C-alpha cells in the first residue's frame, strides 16, 4: 500500500527553569524509528527501531548534527513568537513542527507536508503545491512574506519530493520484515450483563498493524453509530494496535447485532455475531 515518513518536533520554553525542552521523533507509517531528547544524557539522535540500528556512524553523526540544528532554530523561534504575540517572558509556550512525505504503492511521491503550530494552534503551513503558504493569522502573514522572499518553499519542495522519498524507500527496504507487514486483527466479543435485561456486547480487535481500522456495529444490518461506544485506537506497546466498539443490547436480541471489522490485513471484512 501507500507509506509515509514523518518527523515530529516539540519545543517547550521553561523560563527560569533552563533551556527549552526539545523532543524530536521520526516515524515510518505507524512505527517510530528515531528520537532526540534535549534532556537526555547522550545528546545524540538515537535508534528506536532495530532496523535502523545498523545504519552506520555517518548516519548517526549526520542525524545528530541536523537534529541539534533543528533544536537551535526552535529555541530562536520561541523568542521570536513571544515577541510577535507580545507575551511576557515568564510563561511556558510550545512550538510544534511536523514534516514529511507520502508515497504510493509503487513507492513514488504522493504528497509532502511541512506544518508549524504555536501553543497548540496552526501558525503556518506549506500548501499542497509545496510552493506557497497558509498563514493562520496576522502574525503568520509576516513569516509567510519573509519565507516567500527567502524562497524557503523551494528548499522544502526539493527535500519533500526527493530526499524524503528516497530515504523512505531505503527504510522500507531495510525494515522490510517489520514495515511491509500487515498483522490482521485478532477479534473476539465480550458479553456482560449490565443488568437482568441488558448486556453490553464489546467487539475487540487486537494485535493489528497498521493502526488504521474500522469497527462498526449493525442491528438487522442498520448501522448503530449513535448507539456505539468506540474507543480511540491505542498502542499495545509491541508495535501493534488495539481497539474496541461496544453496544448495549436488550433482552435476547443478541442475534440481531453484528460487528463489522475492516482492516488492510483482512482478505475480506469480517462480520461477527454473538451466535
Amino acid at each position: 500500500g501507500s507509506h509515509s515518513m514523518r518527523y515530529f518536533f516539540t519545543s517547550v520554553s521553561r523560563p527560569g527553569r533552563g533551556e527549552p525542552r526539545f523532543i524530536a521523533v521520526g516515524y515510518v507509517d505507524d512505527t517510530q524509528f528515531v528520537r532526540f531528547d534535549s534532556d537526555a544524557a547522550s545528546q545524540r539522535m538515537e535508534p528506536r527501531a532495530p532496523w535502523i540500528e545498523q545504519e552506520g556512524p555517518e548516519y548517526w553523526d549526520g542525524e545528530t548534527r541536523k537534529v541539534k540544528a533543528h533544536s537551535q532554530t526552535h529555541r530562536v523561534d520561541l523568542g521570536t513568537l513571544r515577541g510577535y504575540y507580545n507575551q511576557s517572558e515568564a510563561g511556558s509556550h510550545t512550538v510544534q513542527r511536523m514534516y514529511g512525505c507520502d508515497v504510493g504503492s509503487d513507492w513514488r511521491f504522493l504528497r509532502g507536508y511541512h506544518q508549524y503550530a504555536y501553543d497548540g494552534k496552526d501558525y503556518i503551513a506549506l500548501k499542497e503545491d509545496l510552493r506557497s503558504w497558509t498563514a493562520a493569522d496576522m502574525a503568520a502573514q509576516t513569516t509567510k512574506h519573509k519565507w516567500e522572499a527567502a524562497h524557503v518553499a523551494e528548499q522544502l519542495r526539493a527535500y519533500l519530493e526527493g530526499t524524503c522519498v528516497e530515504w523512505l524507500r531505503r527504510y522500507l527496504e531495510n525494515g522490510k520484515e517489520t514495515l511491509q507487514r500487515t498483522d490482521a486483527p485478532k477479534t473476539h466479543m465480550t458479553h456482560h450483563a449490565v443488568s437482568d435485561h441488558e448486556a453490553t456486547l464489546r467487539c475487540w480487535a487486537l494485535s493489528f498493524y497498521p493502526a488504521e481500522i474500522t469497527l462498526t456495529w449493525q442491528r438487522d444490518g442498520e448501522d448503530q453509530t449513535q448507539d456505539t461506544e468506540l474507543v480511540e485506537t491505542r498502542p499495545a506497546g509491541d508495535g501493534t494496535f488495539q481497539k474496541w466498539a461496544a453496544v448495549v443490547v436488550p433482552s435476547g436480541q443478541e442475534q440481531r447485532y453484528t460487528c463489522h471489522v475492516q482492516h488492510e490485513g483482512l482478505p475480506k471484512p469480517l462480520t461477527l455475531r454473538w451466535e
Binding site: 541536523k66 537534529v67 533543528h70 532554530t73 513569516t143 527567502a150 522544502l156
Partner: peptide, 9 residues
C-alpha cells in the same frame, strides 16, 4: 533522514 536545516521565523 532529516532536512539539512530548518529556516528560522
Amino acid at each position: 533522514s532529516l532536512l539539512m536545516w530548518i529556516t528560522q521565523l
